[PDB]
Amino acid sequence: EFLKPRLVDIEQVSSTHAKVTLEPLERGFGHTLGNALRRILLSSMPGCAVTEVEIDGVLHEYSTKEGVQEDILEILLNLKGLAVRVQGKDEVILTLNKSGIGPVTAADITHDGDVEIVKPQHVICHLTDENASISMRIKVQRGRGYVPASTRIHSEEDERPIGRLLVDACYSPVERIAYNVEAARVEQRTDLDKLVIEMETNGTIDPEEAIRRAATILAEQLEAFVDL
Amino acid sequence: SVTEFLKPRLVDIEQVSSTHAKVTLEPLERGFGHTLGNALRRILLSSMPGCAVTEVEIDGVLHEYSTKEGVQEDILEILLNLKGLAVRVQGKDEVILTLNKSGIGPVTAADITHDGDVEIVKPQHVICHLTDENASISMRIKVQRGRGYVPASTRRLLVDACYSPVERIAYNVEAARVEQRTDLDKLVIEMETNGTIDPEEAIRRAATILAEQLEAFV
Amino acid sequence: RDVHPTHYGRVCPIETPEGPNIGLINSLSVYAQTNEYGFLETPYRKVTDGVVTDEIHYLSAIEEGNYVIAQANSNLDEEGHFVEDLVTCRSKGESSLFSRDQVDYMDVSTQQVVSVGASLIPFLEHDDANRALMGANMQRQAVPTLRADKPLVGTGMERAVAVDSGVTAVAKRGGVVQYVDASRIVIKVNEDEMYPGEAGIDIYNLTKYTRSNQNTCINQMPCVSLGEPVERGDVLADGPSTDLGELALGQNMRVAFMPWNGYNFEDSILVSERVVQEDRFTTIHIQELACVSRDTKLGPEEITADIPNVGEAALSKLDESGIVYIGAEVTGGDILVGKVTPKDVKDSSLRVPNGVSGTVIDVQVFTRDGVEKDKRALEIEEMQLKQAKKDLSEELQILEAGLFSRIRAVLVAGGVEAEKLDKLPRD
Amino acid sequence: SVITVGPYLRLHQCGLPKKMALELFKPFIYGKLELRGLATTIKAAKKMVEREEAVVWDILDEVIREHPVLLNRAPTLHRLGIQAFEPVLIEGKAIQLHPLV
Amino acid sequence: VYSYTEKKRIRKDFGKRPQVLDVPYLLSIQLDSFQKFIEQDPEGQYGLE
Amino acid sequence: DIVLNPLGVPSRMNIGQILETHLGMAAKGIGDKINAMLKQQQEVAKLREFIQRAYDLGADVRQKVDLSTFSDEEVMRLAENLRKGMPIATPVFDGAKEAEIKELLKLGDLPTSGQIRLYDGRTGEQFERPVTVGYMYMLKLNHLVDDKM
Amino acid sequence: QDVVLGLYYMTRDCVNAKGEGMVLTGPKEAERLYRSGLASLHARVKVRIT
Amino acid sequence: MLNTCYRILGLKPTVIFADQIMYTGFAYAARSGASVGIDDMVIPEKKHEIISEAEAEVAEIQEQFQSGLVTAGERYNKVIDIWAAANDRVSKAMMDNLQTETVINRDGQEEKQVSFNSIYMMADSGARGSAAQIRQLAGMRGLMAKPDGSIIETPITANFREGLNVLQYFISTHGARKGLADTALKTANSGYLTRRLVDVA
């Protein structure tokens, strides 16, 4: 007689951090469930990421542009700090054109609706001169986990364009995970547990949807063990 | 695909023994193999339900620790033997098991004056060693349903409710190479059941219990 | 290689190169001075009337033996009077709790005995010595990082050391960053610091991604915003491993000292793979590979794009002059620099080394004096000329601005219509 | 190559840099592939090795099976200082080593 | 007087004893030697003079 | 992020590592409270009070500074630099006292001992003893494996 | 070292430990009890030693 | 136990038992969840009192020597003796506090037991470290000798965790450098000796 605790609530601590509680839970089963779910969510959470860099007029990735505050390598270093919930996409060449003296922001990314920039407030670049301008093609691709682009370098046996700069993909947008095993109040049986799982992400997916996909993956794996 | 996770390829269940056997699972998702191993470990550790001889109303028992006369065992040793007594039962949540034995010789688990509703895993399993021919054995044992290994102190000679029908279980994570990929993990699981359950059947059952618990988030 | 009591607060006491040079090489202590003859005139607070006068007795060895100097850590009253009578005093090379009267000079600073890396040691007193020397040598053996992190715990001198480094940009004169660009940074030097002929415009072209003696990275990346007012000498551009005005070497990692299933013992390094995905300790190597068109007997080593028994794809990275394009993706063994020798021609192609694949960062073609330059070299020279003309025209623009400003001021004072002056071009 | 502390490996097991492994049995690999019939030309074998094929990788896994080869750790103080072990390819360039060795 | 770069970062210094003397410029020895080597000294005690 | 075998401690006798970890944890906690007020977008007066007390933390320290003298814009910039944590100075033979580290951890809202009950993730069970865990800066030498290969 | 460390740790015994003075039939029983946390690893207990 | 295994279990069974033991030790150590804390360095409680008594003895000896009652060499020897004895008493008290821990019984009666003091644990375990290293870290570094080996009668009453007196730090530096140089030198001759033996054989 195993009572399956359901997704009780999702109290979003923030856009990228949220609170999820699970109840009523079997004694001790909650702890195992939480550890497993944490591992799973951290494991292969599908996500999207900027993958290839294409900026007009740049040869070596270790280079810089006049009026550009930082270097192309530093440009990619900044670009690594992007979070967005894109819809129906797996490989998108994004655009970010900024001109004049000032900092290019995430909103400054020339954006279509297909990608929802989770934090448009984030800063993209900083064009330091009024005569300075920025415009580049940013290949944003879906995925999961953190995959170095150097691995993709040999994979693309076709010659990448001179400046077709690749970037590693930590497509898994989960930021942090936590789980508080509390006791669920259900009639008189004290063994019911109210597991409070704390989830921090990049904010590109809801806690409930991620939990559901993770449960799907978990059962898909468990298929063989049930087949025992 | 993206969500496409490496489903394990059925390797083997090394049927080392009837109650002890080794389970091989490879490939396994990196650490998700380890995660699942720990999970199933916890499950089988606690989620194994079953009957359990809890409170034995042995005749003339007044001291938890005592030395039985005409039987090669102590009263405390007899209580440990009653906890050890393993059987495959059906239909009764709580059963008072009668043990009729006497005479010089070892009392096996067959020496229990028991009904047919329960199938002793090893009626051979020495219930005691009644040393004296004049010695006579009389006892009632509260074989009660439960789960896990609840202590007797967690609760009539109380015995630990080791309703967990698994003697032991172990898991080992190995590494696998997938064509050119080599970061893949390999799951090796060692199981020592209490025999009342088949190994693969028990694994399927635990997986089912876990999935049933996991349904409400599916 | 021994250490003498004479060396008390004299030279590098822990710093020692390893190998056969063990003990063979020492270094200067921090705060001891040098006599005209090359003797350690170690500064010491002249303990005048027992009060450690601000008079710093830069004391030599004989004088050291000729004076009774107490420990710098000794507790003294506000008037400089020692709290205790039997003050621990180094006297004639023998340090002892000497009488308050016995004090002659006072030890200058705690770090005075220490050397540089020695003063960099955190909480060294609560620690041992051997591993201290080991980490000291390792600090020299440290490699340059990619992104900088100030060591959260400081001994103070880290900022001082970074200032001492000088690889970063410091202010020649004070002012505000007039024009900030990735390569050329212009700082508006204040008129106060501006010499009469001086424009008052400070230009500092920062170092960025240069190969070091170990073929290591060198980048004095900018560390200021345009127009930020600063005092003369202030740090401007974050040098390689120089950040926040502090010597940036370590990465403050939250860690625990416990074993993990044999994966951690014997000083095994337990690492969060996130940091690897974060590349929190990534780096780069810039190994210069030079090709020389050696004038050989049957004809010079013909570094040229025409290579027999070669494929066009192998020539992809090389420019039409056979010059591996700036940033061109090269391969181990690939033909980076098409070169030839006589056979008719024996292909002497300076191929990029086996196991050496990557982006062709730069090609410094230094043709022999008396040997012409390719369009690639011509273009490199043109780019350098463009940069030089840029800086020069910036100075000349400031100058012409001043000149035309004086001219317009004289015109306005002379009644020339400033409206018509503004409407007309500056010329 | 730098010795790595392969705490996972058995006493007989050895942590062999798979790239270095490839550098090693390359002729043995070519022979295996010809034995695998796939190798018709030795140059083709070199190319497939350069292809670093999973088929090549699998064949290497096969060849490695119980094909221990000599290993040594300096300095040559005792004869125990150099010993071979059952070499299992480890993806990379580290020499994973058994605990008590 | 406080430097702008010093106000920019104030590490909580655990140093209790007074920093009575300023830290010496580390470049002292090499700079002094090179200067003594380079100058045309009327004294003729050191250098090419 | 990192973990070390505690065995080499008495071996190398380099308790400076222990001091470094404890101080790093304490300062990280202090700067964390600061960055929390920052994310809280608290009063620049309140953030100023926190930052000042932190810099003002200590007894008889040679350093003495006043964030009131620092402009409100300057206070903001200083906090922005100090977002990642609270850098501190402690010269040779002038390092912080044990009680000083304790105070810093108190302002850091961190455990006094510096040993935390961090459950092992792989084990899925709490560490048997409070584990000394803290922030410290490490280094990597020019001894690249590619060279050793 | 580390192996010796774990060895001593398992060898370490506690007074008034988590469930002192119990009976474990064999290695499987204690393995369950401690692995389930029912008892401290440093608990002194009588066990049938074959 | 391993020796008994090689004896009875011979070779292969002993090796199997060994591999299992290695895995088990790593696992049990990881689960042992113990670390080392800077607070674990419990300096001896009466270490200061011991230092004071040693100071009193040194004062009496110096008074006699200044009074001429003690020879200067006799004074040096007596001071070295007093310092060594104090270091011994300090290390003794340090270990005595360290290895033992009081515990309330299952009946709640407080009783000393083998301390789980991580330092005293690793000591009683002996997996690494020396009781001398204990004296150095939390007891006293003791009286060191001059770099010439002459017993520098000043005892380093401080402890390594307790922090080093600058004088004491410099004093220890001499012996440290001596040891390092000695190792550097000795790194050579054994090779020639072995080469000779081998060329002979």
PDB file of C-alpha atoms in Angstrom, chain C residues 200-317:
ATOM      1  CA  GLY C 200      47.707  66.249 -21.010  1.00  0.00           C
ATOM      2  CA  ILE C 201      46.433  63.235 -22.921  1.00  0.00           C
ATOM      3  CA  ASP C 202      47.907  59.968 -21.653  1.00  0.00           C
ATOM      4  CA  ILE C 203      47.934  57.048 -24.098  1.00  0.00           C
ATOM      5  CA  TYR C 204      48.741  53.533 -22.884  1.00  0.00           C
ATOM      6  CA  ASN C 205      48.541  50.671 -25.379  1.00  0.00           C
ATOM      7  CA  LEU C 206      47.863  47.621 -23.218  1.00  0.00           C
ATOM      8  CA  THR C 207      49.505  44.223 -23.530  1.00  0.00           C
ATOM      9  CA  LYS C 208      47.120  41.532 -24.767  1.00  0.00           C
ATOM     10  CA  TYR C 209      47.750  37.826 -25.369  1.00  0.00           C
ATOM     11  CA  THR C 210      51.509  37.685 -25.880  1.00  0.00           C
ATOM     12  CA  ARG C 211      53.825  34.679 -25.800  1.00  0.00           C
ATOM     13  CA  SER C 212      56.115  34.642 -22.774  1.00  0.00           C
ATOM     14  CA  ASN C 213      59.549  33.211 -22.079  1.00  0.00           C
ATOM     15  CA  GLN C 214      57.776  29.908 -21.453  1.00  0.00           C
ATOM     16  CA  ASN C 215      55.670  30.665 -24.555  1.00  0.00           C
ATOM     17  CA  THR C 216      53.060  31.663 -21.967  1.00  0.00           C
ATOM     18  CA  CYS C 217      50.258  34.197 -22.213  1.00  0.00           C
ATOM     19  CA  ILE C 218      50.728  37.921 -21.606  1.00  0.00           C
ATOM     20  CA  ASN C 219      47.678  40.185 -21.486  1.00  0.00           C
ATOM     21  CA  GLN C 220      47.601  43.525 -19.665  1.00  0.00           C
ATOM     22  CA  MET C 221      43.858  43.646 -20.244  1.00  0.00           C
ATOM     23  CA  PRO C 222      42.133  46.981 -19.540  1.00  0.00           C
ATOM     24  CA  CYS C 223      40.835  47.455 -16.000  1.00  0.00           C
ATOM     25  CA  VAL C 224      39.264  50.943 -16.011  1.00  0.00           C
ATOM     26  CA  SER C 225      36.349  52.902 -17.451  1.00  0.00           C
ATOM     27  CA  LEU C 226      36.568  55.944 -19.694  1.00  0.00           C
ATOM     28  CA  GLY C 227      36.910  59.250 -17.896  1.00  0.00           C
ATOM     29  CA  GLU C 228      37.483  57.726 -14.504  1.00  0.00           C
ATOM     30  CA  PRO C 229      39.583  60.258 -12.565  1.00  0.00           C
ATOM     31  CA  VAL C 230      42.730  58.729 -11.083  1.00  0.00           C
ATOM     32  CA  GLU C 231      45.921  59.769  -9.315  1.00  0.00           C
ATOM     33  CA  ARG C 232      49.309  59.506 -10.999  1.00  0.00           C
ATOM     34  CA  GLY C 233      50.757  56.014 -10.763  1.00  0.00           C
ATOM     35  CA  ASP C 234      47.373  54.338 -10.342  1.00  0.00           C
ATOM     36  CA  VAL C 235      46.894  50.930 -11.937  1.00  0.00           C
ATOM     37  CA  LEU C 236      45.040  51.083 -15.242  1.00  0.00           C
ATOM     38  CA  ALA C 237      44.916  47.782 -17.161  1.00  0.00           C
ATOM     39  CA  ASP C 238      44.649  44.368 -15.521  1.00  0.00           C
ATOM     40  CA  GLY C 239      47.931  42.702 -16.362  1.00  0.00           C
ATOM     41  CA  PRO C 240      48.390  38.974 -16.828  1.00  0.00           C
ATOM     42  CA  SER C 241      47.418  37.481 -13.457  1.00  0.00           C
ATOM     43  CA  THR C 242      47.183  41.055 -12.147  1.00  0.00           C
ATOM     44  CA  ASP C 243      43.649  41.980 -11.114  1.00  0.00           C
ATOM     45  CA  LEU C 244      41.956  44.474  -8.777  1.00  0.00           C
ATOM     46  CA  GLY C 245      45.375  45.966  -8.143  1.00  0.00           C
ATOM     47  CA  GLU C 246      46.302  42.731  -6.360  1.00  0.00           C
ATOM     48  CA  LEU C 247      48.526  39.818  -7.302  1.00  0.00           C
ATOM     49  CA  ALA C 248      45.896  37.435  -8.700  1.00  0.00           C
ATOM     50  CA  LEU C 249      47.125  33.846  -8.563  1.00  0.00           C
ATOM     51  CA  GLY C 250      44.815  31.609  -6.546  1.00  0.00           C
ATOM     52  CA  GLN C 251      41.205  30.548  -7.022  1.00  0.00           C
ATOM     53  CA  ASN C 252      39.379  30.566  -3.705  1.00  0.00           C
ATOM     54  CA  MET C 253      37.688  27.170  -3.741  1.00  0.00           C
ATOM     55  CA  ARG C 254      35.353  25.959  -1.022  1.00  0.00           C
ATOM     56  CA  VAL C 255      36.785  22.554  -0.159  1.00  0.00           C
ATOM     57  CA  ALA C 256      36.890  19.998   2.645  1.00  0.00           C
ATOM     58  CA  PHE C 257      39.758  17.953   4.078  1.00  0.00           C
ATOM     59  CA  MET C 258      38.428  14.415   4.063  1.00  0.00           C
ATOM     60  CA  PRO C 259      39.061  11.219   2.080  1.00  0.00           C
ATOM     61  CA  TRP C 260      36.583  10.053  -0.566  1.00  0.00           C
ATOM     62  CA  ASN C 261      36.709   6.306  -1.245  1.00  0.00           C
ATOM     63  CA  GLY C 262      40.398   6.233  -2.120  1.00  0.00           C
ATOM     64  CA  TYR C 263      39.863   8.830  -4.830  1.00  0.00           C
ATOM     65  CA  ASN C 264      41.385  11.513  -2.567  1.00  0.00           C
ATOM     66  CA  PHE C 265      44.212   9.923  -0.565  1.00  0.00           C
ATOM     67  CA  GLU C 266      47.934  10.361  -1.249  1.00  0.00           C
ATOM     68  CA  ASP C 267      47.133  13.992  -2.060  1.00  0.00           C
ATOM     69  CA  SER C 268      44.850  13.023  -4.932  1.00  0.00           C
ATOM     70  CA  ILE C 269      43.046  16.049  -6.347  1.00  0.00           C
ATOM     71  CA  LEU C 270      39.264  15.892  -5.957  1.00  0.00           C
ATOM     72  CA  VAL C 271      37.781  18.226  -8.562  1.00  0.00           C
ATOM     73  CA  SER C 272      34.258  19.401  -9.278  1.00  0.00           C
ATOM     74  CA  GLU C 273      33.580  18.657 -12.928  1.00  0.00           C
ATOM     75  CA  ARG C 274      31.513  21.852 -12.947  1.00  0.00           C
ATOM     76  CA  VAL C 275      34.738  23.831 -12.595  1.00  0.00           C
ATOM     77  CA  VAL C 276      36.033  21.932 -15.613  1.00  0.00           C
ATOM     78  CA  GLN C 277      32.866  22.774 -17.526  1.00  0.00           C
ATOM     79  CA  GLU C 278      33.347  26.238 -16.058  1.00  0.00           C
ATOM     80  CA  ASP C 279      37.019  26.012 -17.117  1.00  0.00           C
ATOM     81  CA  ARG C 280      37.814  27.863 -13.895  1.00  0.00           C
ATOM     82  CA  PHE C 281      41.501  26.976 -14.369  1.00  0.00           C
ATOM     83  CA  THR C 282      41.778  26.956 -18.163  1.00  0.00           C
ATOM     84  CA  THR C 283      44.811  28.339 -19.967  1.00  0.00           C
ATOM     85  CA  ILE C 284      46.467  28.799 -23.352  1.00  0.00           C
ATOM     86  CA  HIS C 285      49.883  28.120 -24.867  1.00  0.00           C
ATOM     87  CA  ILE C 286      51.399  30.370 -27.524  1.00  0.00           C
ATOM     88  CA  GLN C 287      54.506  28.643 -28.857  1.00  0.00           C
ATOM     89  CA  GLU C 288      56.275  30.714 -31.497  1.00  0.00           C
ATOM     90  CA  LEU C 289      57.133  28.703 -34.605  1.00  0.00           C
ATOM     91  CA  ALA C 290      59.516  30.615 -36.855  1.00  0.00           C
ATOM     92  CA  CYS C 291      60.387  29.730 -40.448  1.00  0.00           C
ATOM     93  CA  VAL C 292      63.649  31.020 -41.919  1.00  0.00           C
ATOM     94  CA  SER C 293      64.134  31.391 -45.668  1.00  0.00           C
ATOM     95  CA  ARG C 294      67.775  30.365 -45.396  1.00  0.00           C
ATOM     96  CA  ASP C 295      69.904  31.404 -48.355  1.00  0.00           C
ATOM     97  CA  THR C 296      71.096  27.966 -49.456  1.00  0.00           C
ATOM     98  CA  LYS C 297      73.766  27.077 -51.993  1.00  0.00           C
ATOM     99  CA  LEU C 298      71.551  25.944 -54.872  1.00  0.00           C
ATOM    100  CA  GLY C 299      69.199  28.822 -54.084  1.00  0.00           C
ATOM    101  CA  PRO C 300      67.713  30.151 -50.855  1.00  0.00           C
ATOM    102  CA  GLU C 301      65.160  28.176 -48.886  1.00  0.00           C
ATOM    103  CA  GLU C 302      62.197  29.209 -51.028  1.00  0.00           C
ATOM    104  CA  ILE C 303      59.392  29.926 -48.576  1.00  0.00           C
ATOM    105  CA  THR C 304      56.623  30.149 -51.151  1.00  0.00           C
ATOM    106  CA  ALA C 305      53.079  28.970 -51.746  1.00  0.00           C
ATOM    107  CA  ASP C 306      54.051  26.782 -54.736  1.00  0.00           C
ATOM    108  CA  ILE C 307      54.819  23.342 -53.279  1.00  0.00           C
ATOM    109  CA  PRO C 308      55.089  20.247 -55.497  1.00  0.00           C
ATOM    110  CA  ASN C 309      53.641  16.933 -54.317  1.00  0.00           C
ATOM    111  CA  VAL C 310      51.182  18.793 -52.087  1.00  0.00           C
ATOM    112  CA  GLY C 311      47.423  19.183 -51.946  1.00  0.00           C
ATOM    113  CA  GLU C 312      45.418  22.370 -52.262  1.00  0.00           C
ATOM    114  CA  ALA C 313      43.495  21.502 -49.094  1.00  0.00           C
ATOM    115  CA  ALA C 314      46.832  21.324 -47.292  1.00  0.00           C
ATOM    116  CA  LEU C 315      47.305  24.884 -48.588  1.00  0.00           C
ATOM    117  CA  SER C 316      43.946  26.050 -47.210  1.00  0.00           C
ATOM    118  CA  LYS C 317      45.285  27.591 -43.997  1.00  0.00           C
TER     119      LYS C 317
END
